[PDB]
Write a protein that binds this ligand. Sequence first.
Ligand SMILES: Nc1ncnc2c1ncn2[C@@H]1O[C@H](COP(=O)(O)O)[C@@H](O)[C@H]1O
Ligand SMILES: Nc1ncnc2c1ncn2[C@@H]1O[C@H](COP(=O)(O)O)[C@@H](O)[C@H]1O
Ligand SMILES: Nc1ncnc2c1ncn2[C@@H]1O[C@H](COP(=O)(O)O)[C@@H](O)[C@H]1O
Ligand SMILES: Nc1ncnc2c1ncn2[C@@H]1O[C@H](COP(=O)(O)O)[C@@H](O)[C@H]1O
Ligand SMILES: Nc1ncnc2c1ncn2[C@@H]1O[C@H](COP(=O)(O)O)[C@@H](O)[C@H]1O
Ligand SMILES: O=P(O)(O)OC[C@H]1O[C@H](O)[C@H](O)[C@@H]1O
Ligand SMILES: O=P(O)(O)OC[C@H]1O[C@H](O)[C@H](O)[C@@H]1O
Ligand SMILES: O=P(O)(O)OC[C@H]1O[C@H](O)[C@H](O)[C@@H]1O
Ligand SMILES: O=P(O)(O)OC[C@H]1O[C@H](O)[C@H](O)[C@@H]1O
Ligand SMILES: O=P(O)(O)OC[C@H]1O[C@H](O)[C@H](O)[C@@H]1O
Ligand SMILES: O=P(O)(O)OC[C@H]1O[C@H](O)[C@H](O)[C@@H]1O
Ligand SMILES: [Mg+2]
Ligand SMILES: [Mg+2]
Ligand SMILES: [Mg+2]
Ligand SMILES: [Mg+2]
Ligand SMILES: [Mg+2]
Ligand SMILES: [Mg+2]
Ligand SMILES: [Mg+2]
Lengths: 307, 307, 307, 307, 307, 307
Amino acid sequence: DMKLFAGNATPELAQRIANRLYTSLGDAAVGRFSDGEVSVQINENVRGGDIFIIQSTCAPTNDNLMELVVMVDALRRASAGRITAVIPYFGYARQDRRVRSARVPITAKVVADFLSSVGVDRVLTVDLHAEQIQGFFDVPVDNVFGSPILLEDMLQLNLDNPIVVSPDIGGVVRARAIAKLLNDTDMAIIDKRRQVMHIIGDVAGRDCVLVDDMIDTGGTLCKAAEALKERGAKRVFAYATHPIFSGNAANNLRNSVIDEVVVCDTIPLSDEIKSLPNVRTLTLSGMLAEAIRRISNEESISAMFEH
Amino acid sequence: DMKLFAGNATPELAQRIANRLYTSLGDAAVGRFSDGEVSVQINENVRGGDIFIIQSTCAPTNDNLMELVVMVDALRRASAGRITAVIPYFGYARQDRRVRSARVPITAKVVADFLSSVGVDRVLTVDLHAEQIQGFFDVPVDNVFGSPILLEDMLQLNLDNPIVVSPDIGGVVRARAIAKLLNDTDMAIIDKRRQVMHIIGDVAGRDCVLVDDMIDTGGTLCKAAEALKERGAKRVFAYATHPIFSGNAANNLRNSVIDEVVVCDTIPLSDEIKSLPNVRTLTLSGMLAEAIRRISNEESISAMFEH
Amino acid sequence: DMKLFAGNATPELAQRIANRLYTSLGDAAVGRFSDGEVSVQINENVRGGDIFIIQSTCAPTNDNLMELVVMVDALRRASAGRITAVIPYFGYARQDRRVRSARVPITAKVVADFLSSVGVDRVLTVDLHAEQIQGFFDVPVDNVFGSPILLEDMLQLNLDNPIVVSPDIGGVVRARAIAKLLNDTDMAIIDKRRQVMHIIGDVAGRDCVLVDDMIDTGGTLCKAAEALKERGAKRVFAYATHPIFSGNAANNLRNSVIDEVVVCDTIPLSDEIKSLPNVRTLTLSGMLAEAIRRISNEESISAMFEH
Amino acid sequence: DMKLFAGNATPELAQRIANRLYTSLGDAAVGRFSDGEVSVQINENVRGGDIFIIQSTCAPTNDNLMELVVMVDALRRASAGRITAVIPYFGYARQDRRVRSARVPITAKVVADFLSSVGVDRVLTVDLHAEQIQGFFDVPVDNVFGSPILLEDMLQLNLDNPIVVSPDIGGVVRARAIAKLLNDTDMAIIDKRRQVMHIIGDVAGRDCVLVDDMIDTGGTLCKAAEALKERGAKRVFAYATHPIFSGNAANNLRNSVIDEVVVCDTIPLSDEIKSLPNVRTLTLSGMLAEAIRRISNEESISAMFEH
Amino acid sequence: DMKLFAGNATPELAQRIANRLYTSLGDAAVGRFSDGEVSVQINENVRGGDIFIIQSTCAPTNDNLMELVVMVDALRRASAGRITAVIPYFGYARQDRRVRSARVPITAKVVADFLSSVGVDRVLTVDLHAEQIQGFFDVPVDNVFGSPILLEDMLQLNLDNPIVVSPDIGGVVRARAIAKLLNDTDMAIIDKRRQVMHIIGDVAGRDCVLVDDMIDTGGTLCKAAEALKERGAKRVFAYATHPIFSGNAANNLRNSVIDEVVVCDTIPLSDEIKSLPNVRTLTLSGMLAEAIRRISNEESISAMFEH
Amino acid sequence: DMKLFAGNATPELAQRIANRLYTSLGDAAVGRFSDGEVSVQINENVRGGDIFIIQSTCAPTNDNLMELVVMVDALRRASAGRITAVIPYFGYARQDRRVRSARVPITAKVVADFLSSVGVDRVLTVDLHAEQIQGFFDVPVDNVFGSPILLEDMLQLNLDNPIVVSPDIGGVVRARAIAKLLNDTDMAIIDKRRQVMHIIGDVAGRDCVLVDDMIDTGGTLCKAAEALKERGAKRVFAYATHPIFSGNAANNLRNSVIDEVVVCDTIPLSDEIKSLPNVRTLTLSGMLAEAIRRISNEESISAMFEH
Ligand SMILES: Nc1ncnc2c1ncn2[C@@H]1O[C@H](COP(=O)(O)O)[C@@H](O)[C@H]1O
Ligand SMILES: Nc1ncnc2c1ncn2[C@@H]1O[C@H](COP(=O)(O)O)[C@@H](O)[C@H]1O
Ligand SMILES: Nc1ncnc2c1ncn2[C@@H]1O[C@H](COP(=O)(O)O)[C@@H](O)[C@H]1O
Ligand SMILES: Nc1ncnc2c1ncn2[C@@H]1O[C@H](COP(=O)(O)O)[C@@H](O)[C@H]1O
Ligand SMILES: Nc1ncnc2c1ncn2[C@@H]1O[C@H](COP(=O)(O)O)[C@@H](O)[C@H]1O
Ligand SMILES: O=P(O)(O)OC[C@H]1O[C@H](O)[C@H](O)[C@@H]1O
Ligand SMILES: O=P(O)(O)OC[C@H]1O[C@H](O)[C@H](O)[C@@H]1O
Ligand SMILES: O=P(O)(O)OC[C@H]1O[C@H](O)[C@H](O)[C@@H]1O
Ligand SMILES: O=P(O)(O)OC[C@H]1O[C@H](O)[C@H](O)[C@@H]1O
Ligand SMILES: O=P(O)(O)OC[C@H]1O[C@H](O)[C@H](O)[C@@H]1O
Ligand SMILES: O=P(O)(O)OC[C@H]1O[C@H](O)[C@H](O)[C@@H]1O
Ligand SMILES: [Mg+2]
Ligand SMILES: [Mg+2]
Ligand SMILES: [Mg+2]
Ligand SMILES: [Mg+2]
Ligand SMILES: [Mg+2]
Ligand SMILES: [Mg+2]
Ligand SMILES: [Mg+2]
């Protein structure tokens, strides 16, 4: 008995996933009270059922997170059988350690504990910022890579001896994976010091493909593109998974040298970003639908990592 | 080693409490990242100390709640000794049961579990909506009544044989307590059916004192005042503790028959409400300061319930 | 695989519930050792089954509570699948908070923690003293109102413009619900001060119906009846759900002015009470049987709250 | 800050322990409500203090156990620092396993879980039935042997080449320890089959000393004494620690051949037993007082096991 | 969906159990990394299945224990349904209490907590050293006696009025059970003091059968055999369940007077022990296979304790 | 009351740390029983004390881990106050996620759960393989970098325009940190594909400094050195923190082109490795002693990250 429920964060993606599964979204009234508190009511029998909740913890981050945990609590007191939380974009994931024992929280661990507390049985995400966040839960966590869609889109560009560049030091593993998949090309890395940006590798007269896991303000992306072009690269393409686009992202992308920015749909786009002419969107609904189908049927999930 | 920390919800109240304790607020940078996520950094040694955090979970409710739990987590990983959360207004407290086994959450229990999960050792609140929320925690919870301040203000009005009215059926216990304290006067109750409001009791030619625990939209308050005046009451005064004032509260209070509305300061007032000429504010900083002082010194807290 | 087990508290009610479900009580030897310790032995295979235990925590309260938790432990180590505890009368429910931070326990929370500790999966009660006790558990709790049976009995009295009276301030919500159900009549409330009892409302020349959730000693009930009659009420009927009848209840009811006392059967009656001529009993076996049937079949429980 | 509190089970022993510590019992009102429910109120400040509760879980077993857990809960919500439960006789300790996977509970584990749930920090008992019950807790458990007092009393009898006999197979380890302490004498064991009792060892013309951990009904004790005398033993003395004396114990001991029965005071004696001329009582107040003193002062507890 | 997995401790026994169940061992690669750390990989779909893991915690004890807990963790994150751990020999079981409050651990409780932590749902062992270790878990534990096989082997010896002897005081209960089963014969006990060994009972001119639960170094066994022969016993046979055989066991058994040593196969034998001519092995694969079959089918396990 | 205890893994390091703190190691007998099981006995009063246990989880990994958890359990049942585990080398840390949802365990999370289960209050490690393992605990974890000692040793080599190389893609962050500290030099990275090793960066005619966190078999290190020399580098130095040196490490290092290998002392060296002429050891005893001193005195730990 598979039922899908959606919050207010990604309703359109939840509709696409439901369409690809040939079912319909379950009836739940998820809204706000007068003072801003989350209101949830489940409007159908869920006893013994296998429930999936689809909601990214994107901006407004805290309201979306509260919607998620409150729906899980309402479902779990209504005697639901098993609850899987599909969270295409896992928010607060960049706060995953205390560097130099600074007096900061590990907020990803706090969110994982909240989800375990209200009674989630399984989590399914796309492109976690740190893969060790799989260990912040006591439940199985399936971290699905978004690279098949992006790679299928890259191979339709007919680049002239492309080189894969990671905009920073934290993206090197993902850049290397993409470089191996993209006919096993070269790789270069942007290193930032003091300000001045150094490039480790040769980018002279080649098409450069920047790959990252998110675009928040476009700062690192735009700066790396400027560095690549001023060391003589023909074209630069940016390829990310999570389109956060916060702050001054629209102006940063508009006044940039990036020829094309391609993102997935784990977060809905705003109006100013949709108005931009060089920002294009791929869809992850098929991949998420197949993962949900495999989880619901006691099937192996390893087939989801094939290209 | 008593240290006080404040969030962004009630900073001015935290300053008044610190002033009455002749100390200063501890240094912590509590803010937002670019995308709306809570940022916390403790900027001083808290090892082994006795920490108090002062923050109401008022609107914006979810951001304030996340600030609170994230500060508790950061303090607890920095090896703080004991953490007391002073929460003058406990949000989400109106969702405390499932009526008729409706498929709703018990969100107050969820919030209590989150606070117990991040490592709170003690909670101190003012005028909980339901006193049974004391049982939603495994830690001691001190629910301090705000009625001493309000009563001290009522006794300075020189009312002509006043009668204490509860605007609804849920406020009868608080109304009875106030009526006993206010020279042991009469009590009347507003009952709403179908629309039409019935008054149980005699209110003809008497000064009426409405008492409640919050004013959210002013709906029940304004309607009860209209009923009281159209059954012939001389003057009506409204006395509440938590000034939520959400939605159309300013217009409802402006176009009403209530002569004076008196509230406490557990939630900061907006500009439109401060502009109103018949809304007046009392302060709870002395009572909270004395409660914090008694908790810090291993002293009996029962003296806080004296009039 | 539905199996019913019964303790020693309410065996006759368990038999009626079994009869209405067309099954038989499971074989378990629940008794006492020589020194008063609870002895439990399950005498049949319960592996993977869906178990229901029917036992009120009525007097002797502590022996009944220990029987319940010990049966749950024996069933859970015998590899039972799911255990539902049907507790028609939830004892210790009047101790649900600490008033004025008095150094008392919250014993309802202690009992809820014990039940969660031995491994109960679901609780089903009738007319909880405080509905917030639903939040003292981490499991679903279904609090079924006994008002349908009592209302069906009230409507067969043909009262002359009846008025519904709550004997104290804590029963106002239940009295209001009954008043709405009983053709939407008036409501009056007994208020006790200092001794002297005040009645808020008009009771002159009307049939009065006192409604409460329990009758423990009959003190409040008898006193309220005396007040109602000495302000001129024609007849007084008392309507309760839980017949505790402790202490001097028999003498208090015998030497009273109440014309008829009607109770449910969540607690068995003693001999002295059955000898009384004006105490009558209704049965809840049909309602509990239907609730058990709906829980066992993954059906919606909301239909149980219909009149 | 050492404070002692006592329940209703062993108040006189608690007074003796307080006298030997030159302090007084703390003020707490522990009683019953009208219907038999436990009532507890702490009447003094216990914040930060080191609390000891002295109460055996003797008959009436369940009321005493509930008093204990309810006092612990009331103390723990009043912000007590550390709570030690001194339980001279640990009830329900004979139910410590499931023999042949019988569908019975392990009730000692249930009691240990309840004590850990309400927040006990340390347990101190005398002569546990099974020493592995130390492993049923997550807190330190100090199981103090009562054999020093009993041995000091045995050595004042001037027996003629005594032999130490265990009445059953479960008491062999304790009998061997006593035999080693009692000038390293011989040991014999009673074995019961089918009825007929076999004695392994030689008891002809010797003074026999039966040692056990409890006397519940006197069945095994009286039967073993009869067997010993009908295989020709001069005198038989019975030496136990816990005087349960339930059921027909008074008649069994009166119509027996045991010359003298000596017990400790972990359970108060009834009137019929005190009337018996050959039942004598030793006291454990000094040993328990010294153990409490050593626990309170961060001193080594190993000195308590010296003879 | 019953699947069997085996570790490296008892692979041959796991094969025999699989053969008697007419299935095959599941595919899992359990090995060591270069530095000695346990490596585990499950090579098949286990989603929703009912898993059994067969592995004794025998020498090397800590590597076997780590293999077990690591396999349980890998299975539980792969979404296995229910995990039963068949542990024919439970290691660390001799450390089950703190005698005289010595500063030692209770290591059996630590192992039980680890197994409960990684997510074991049920434990099945053979001949636990202390039966109270059943209470160290929160899950059902089935402690199956190995005495049927040993008794079936004893009855094929045609002994001349045999007597059953326990080599020490801790084995008396097991010796008594065997003596009752073996046509209800006599029993004698070895008592060790100061060195000198005393025998309680008559062993002159009888065949002696020593029964124990393990043979670790053969010290107690060889010494008891010497004592029995030097008080004139015709033949001595040793009967144990767990063949640990550590240290100098081979030399102790070779230079001994025991005519025949019979053991079960809960631990594999070494080469030096297999070379011995008077050490013989029985098999427990049929009994364990039937217990696994009964657990998998929701059948009563009590039939396993029949002779 | 600071007490230090040591296991058998790193006794000599524990002695150096004790010497720098001007105290002595506490008395505890930590050994093995006959069959290989861990034996622990604490031989002094530890009640209320602040305990530190110094032991790396190095090879033999599982015995060392069991020693650690068993000592923690023995200390915690002896009523120790606070227990800090100093684990200079955290074993099993390389298994920190499930790549592509492979059916493997996350063994670092299992070890963290075991340590939290037995009652550790704080962990202090050196150079964790993944810094997110800080989030696998609920207690504070201080991950101290070993780079100050290594950098102080590098600056005493007088290299000719050195370049810092990371032998693999996982070491890039550490290599970048060292490069910034080492007068802000260049950085190059070894990339391995299919076999063939690519170097991103220019290493022609420069002194190369390989930095890693461990040396297990020397495979990556020796291969990277060969690649660097066959692209023309003058000298190659290897700088690591944890000297695991397992398998064929001695032969790999002997038949290599690395001029000098410098390691810390978090793991003791074997004889074959000490015989090597180009392997040199630094000490971390001063840094660990200062960290222990700061933890014991409620001082800020951030001063430990200064160069
Ligand atoms: N999109 C991706 N595809 C494949 N591997 C990835 C990706 N993103 C990160 N990785 C990590 O890159 C590493 C690949 O290792 P390998 O299996 O040797 O290619 C693993 O740690 C993966 O978790
Ligand atoms: N017998 C009863 N029938 C209906 N409501 C009840 C009863 N007893 C208590 N209540 C409470 O009365 C309130 C009724 O609210 P409403 O839905 O507005 O009638 C809810 O809080 C119910 O939980
Ligand atoms: N009164 C007692 N005195 C000493 N040991 C006892 C007593 N009762 C039981 N025992 C147990 O007897 C055993 C004595 O072992 P040992 O130290 O060899 O004398 C331990 O297991 C003790 O726990
Ligand atoms: N092999 C065995 N067969 C039967 N009982 C055993 C065995 N080993 C230990 N026992 C214990 O011996 C006792 C037998 O009690 P009974 O049922 O009176 O024979 C129980 O406590 C059993 O757990
Ligand atoms: N030895 C080291 N010194 C400094 N940072 C390190 C070291 N090893 C790893 N790191 C990480 O490198 C990053 C340095 O960031 P930054 O503060 O910008 O230099 C942090 O994530 C550190 O945790
Ligand atoms: O706003 P930006 O910093 O440019 O983008 C967010 C980046 O912060 C993290 O490294 C992510 O990997 C992104 O690369
Ligand atoms: O917006 P309003 O409903 O008028 O005020 C909030 C009320 O809702 C609860 O009963 C509170 O007691 C208040 O009386
Ligand atoms: O013995 P009594 O106090 O008269 O009856 C018990 C009452 O105590 C509680 O308020 C219940 O609602 C009852 O009304
Ligand atoms: O009433 P009784 O059975 O004679 O005495 C209780 C006995 O039950 C247990 O074995 C105890 O050791 C006692 O010996
Ligand atoms: O090496 P051994 O001590 O002779 O054999 C192990 C014994 O230790 C325990 O009592 C077991 O019951 C065994 O009898
Ligand atoms: O035996 P090796 O693989 O050469 O050394 C262990 C390496 O495995 C991990 O990447 C560590 O960072 C090391 O670099
Ligand atoms: Mg980045
Ligand atoms: Mg209200
Ligand atoms: Mg009442
Ligand atoms: Mg006995
Ligand atoms: Mg033993
Ligand atoms: Mg033995
Ligand atoms: Mg590496």
